[PDB]
């Protein structure tokens, strides 16, 4: 349905272009340690706050990842921005990674509240699931994701910082 | 179909957030003249190059518009970038505006070349048209677009700089 298109937009205009350069940007930050993979949080309830630190205080913002620039569809040197977070566990830095929500899920939530979008509020979870299922299929066949990306789907029924650490510790 | 979702993504996560601040950013640039509207080019053939100057040399890049920052889905101070262009006509500056292609049309073109996207190459024009028709409906009912945005649909069968100037001169 709609989720099918946003998943492809998410990969065409973002992951396909910045994943090939992520390791290089992480290397640049360490010297001039952060983990070598982009962690994407996929709350299937489509509850995407704009500040990760408020969804969980154990997720502490640290610094910005070095910018990436690319001439895109008439915008000269368009900036792409990522955020580096520290994950605390009983007041102890247990990890550090490039962490972010999947913005398109936030778009699904908004589409559902607009009247003329023809998107009922009950179809959120079904679309969030189809978005996750469509993205996994793409990245399983994507060379850009040569072990450079990890998805974190979950359904708040709970510590989000613990869920991130679980995947991070297995790295 | 697919175009319906990208048009809403285009408005939810971009135009709805940066149009309320465009005039202020243009004001800041003039003093610290540029036109007071964002011009979006919608080539219905989905031919979106990344450098406007090459689609037409009479379109000359000038400078960057002052950045806009916003906490978005876990990315602290995410930068939004626009480009200011000069439109030449027989070697004379005939206009100056914030000009850019509609990136989502570029995404439609790419989706059509990927095999697993289930998007045939022949459906481009139909989707580019549905994208334009869905965006016009949104902006006709959008308060954010309080005479702050102008769409430029066209089908290359021709001077793109002349097409932009035609809309710009009527402003
Ligand atoms: N973390 C991070 N994620 C990023 C970054 N860039 C993209 N993504 C992800 O990829 C999705 C699809 O990106 P696009 O194919 O480019 O389609 C965009 C584009 F057409 C327009 N748009 C957005 N920002 C700007 C801008 O600064 N300047 C101009 N001129 N246009 C802009 O709005 C559409 C929907 O944006 P949205 O944010 O909802 O979904 C994005 C987002 F999820 C990034 O820097 N950082």
Residues A2, A46: Cα–Cα separation, whole Å: 14
HEC per residue, chain B: CCHHHHHHHHHHHHHHHHHHHHHHHHHHHHHCCCCCCEEEEEECCCCCCCCHHHHCCCEEEEEECCCEEEEECCEEEEEECCEEEEEECCCCEEEEEEEEECHHHHHHHHHHHCHHHCCCHHHHHHHHHHHHHHHHHHHHCCCCCCCCEEEEEECCCCCHHHHHHHHHHHC
B91 and B148 share one domain: yes
The number of C-alpha atoms within 13 Å of B109 and in the hemisphere containing its C-beta is 15
- From A151's Cα to the closest Cα of chain B, the distance in A is 15
b/e map B18-51, b = 16+ CB within 10 Å: bbebbeebbeeeeeeebbebbbbbbbbebebebe
In the reported structure, the alpha carbon of residue A38 is separated from the centroid of ligand 1 by a whole-number distance in angstroms of: 17
- Contact, B1 vs B44, CB < 8 A? no
- Give the count of domains, chain A: 2
Residues with CB under 6 Å of ligand 1 are A 9-10, 13-14, 75, 78, 80-82, 100, 103-104, 107; B 9-10, 13-14, 75, 78, 80-82, 100, 103-104, 107
Distance of CA B159 to the CA centre of its chain: 17
Q: Which of B8, B109, B131, B134 has the highest number of chain A CBs within 10 A, making it the mutation to test binding with A?
A: B8
Residue A158 CB coordination number (10 Å): 9
Neighbouring CB atoms inside 10 A of A136's CB total: 14
> What's the CA angle centered on A108, arms A105 and A113, to 5 degrees?
140
Give the whole-angstrom CA distance, residue B12 versus residue A114: 10
Distance B170 CA to ligand 1 centre (A): 30
Which chain A residues have a beta carbon less than 8 Å from that of B13? 103, 106-107
By the 8 A CB rule, do A108 and A124 touch? Answer: yes
Rg (CA), chain A: 16
Ligand 1 center–CA B90 separation, angstroms: 35
Beta strands A149-154 and B38-43 are unpaired
Query: Is residue A82 located within the same domain as residue A137?
Result: yes
The set of residues, in sequence order, having a beta carbon less than 8 Å from that of A24 and lying 6+ positions away, is none
Report yes or no: B51 at the A interface, CB cutoff 8 Å: yes
Contact residues, B window 76-135, toward A, CB-based 8 Å cutoff: 76-79, 81-83, 99-104, 106-107, 110-111, 114, 116-118
Question: Using a CB cutoff of 8 Å and minimum separation of 24, what contacts does A32-36 make?
Answer: A33/A96, A34/A84, A34/A96, A34/A97, A34/A98, A35/A95, A35/A96, A35/A97, A35/A98, A35/A168, A35/A171, A36/A148, A36/A171
Q: Give CA–CA dist A93/A25, Å, rounded.
A: 22
Name the resolution in angstroms.
2.8
Task: Assess whether A6 and A52 both reside in one domain.
Answer: no
CB contact under 8 A, A9 and B12: no
Residue A88 phi/psi, 5-degree rounding, is: -95, 150
Q: Going by C-beta distance under 8 Å and a sequence separation of 6 or more, which residues neighbour residue B27?
A: none
Cross-sheet strand order for the sheet of B83-88: B59-64, B83-88, B93-101, B38-43, B149-154
Instruction: Tell me, yes or no, whether A99 and A129 share the same domain.
Output: yes
User: Which among B160, B134, B9, B8 is positioned nearest to A74, based on CA atoms?
Assistant: B160
The CA distance from B18 to B26, in Å, is: 12
A-B contacts (CB, under 8 Å) = 122
Distance CA A137, CA B63 (A): 40
Query: Which of A168, A150, A116 has its CA nearest to residue A15?
Result: A150
- Dihedral in degrees, nearest 10, Cα atoms B132, A135, B115, A81: 60
Residues A27 and A108 in one domain: no
| B149: containing domain | 35-171
Q: Could you tell me if B3 and B83 lie in one domain?
A: no
Among A162, A158, A154, A109, residue whose Cα is nearest residue A132? A154
DSSP per-residue letters across chain A: --HHHHHHHHIIIIIHHHHHHHHHHHHHHHH----SSEEEEEETT----S-HHHH-TTEEEEEEPPPEEEEETTEEEEEE--EEEEEESSSSEEEEEEEEE-HHHHHHHHHHHSGGG---GGGHHHHHHHHHHHHHHHHHT-SS-SS-EEEEEE-----HHHHHHHHHHH-
CB A9 within 8 A of CB B6: yes
Q: Are residue A126 and residue A103 in the same domain, yes or no? A: yes
Long-range pairs, A59-64, Cβ under 8 A, ≥24: A59/A85, A59/A86, A59/A87, A59/A88, A59/A99, A59/A160, A59/A161, A59/A164, A60/A85, A60/A86, A60/A87, A60/A88, A61/A85, A61/A86, A61/B76, A62/A86, A62/A96, A63/A29, A64/B76, A64/B77
Residues in contact with A101: Cβ distance below 8 Å, sequence separation at least 6, in sequence order: A40, A41, A43, A48, A49, A52, B73, B74
Instruction: Output the CA torsion sign for A129, B111, B114, B72.
Output: negative
Neighbours of B142 (CB within 10 A): 16
Q: Is the domain of B84 the same as that of B157? A: yes
Indicate if A41 and A14 belong to the same structural domain. no
Chain B residues touching A110 at Cβ < 8 A: 12
Backbone angles phi, psi at A169, to 5 degrees: -65, -35
Ordered strands of the A83-88 beta sheet: A59-64, A83-88, A93-101, A38-43, A149-154
For residue A83, what is the nearest residue in chain B, using CA coordinates? B75
Do A39 and A75 belong together in one domain? yes
Tell me how far the alpha carbon of residue A142 is from its chain's centroid: 17
Residues B158, B107 share a domain: yes
Q: In this structure, which residue's CA is closest to atom 13 in ligand 1?
A: A13
- Most informative mutation of A6, A8, A11, A13 for ligand 1 (most atoms within 8 A of CB): A13
Of B158, B43, B54, B164, which is closest to residue B99 (Cα–Cα)?
Answer: B164
Ramachandran region, residue B48 (left: φ > 0; alpha: ψ -120 to 50; beta: rest): beta
Rounded CA gap, A8 and B118, in Å? 11
Asked if A40 and A59 sit in the same domain, the reply is yes
């Amino acid at each position: 349905n709609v989720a099918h298109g946003l998943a492809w937009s998410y990969y065409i205009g973002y992951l396909r272009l910045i994943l090939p350069e992520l390791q290089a940007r992480i290397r640049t930050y360490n010297q001039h340690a952060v983990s070598q993979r982009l962690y994407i949080l996929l709350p299937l309830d489509c509850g995407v706050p704009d500040n990760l630190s408020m969804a969980d205080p154990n997720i502490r913002f640290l610094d910005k990842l070095p910018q990436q620039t690319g001439d895109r569809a008439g915008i000269k040197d368009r900036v792409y921005s990522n955020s580096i977070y520290e994950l605390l566990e009983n007041g102890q830095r247990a990890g550090t990674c490039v962490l972010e929500y999947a913005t398109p899920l936030q778009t699904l939530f908004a589409m559902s509240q607009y009247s003329q979008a023809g998107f009922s509020r009950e179809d959120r979870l079904e679309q969030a699931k189809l978005f996750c299922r469509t993205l996994e299929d793409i990245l399983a066949d994507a060379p850009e994701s040569q072990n450079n990306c990890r998805l974190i789907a979950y359904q708040e029924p709970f510590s989000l910082s613990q869920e991130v650490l679980r995947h991070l510790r297995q790295e």
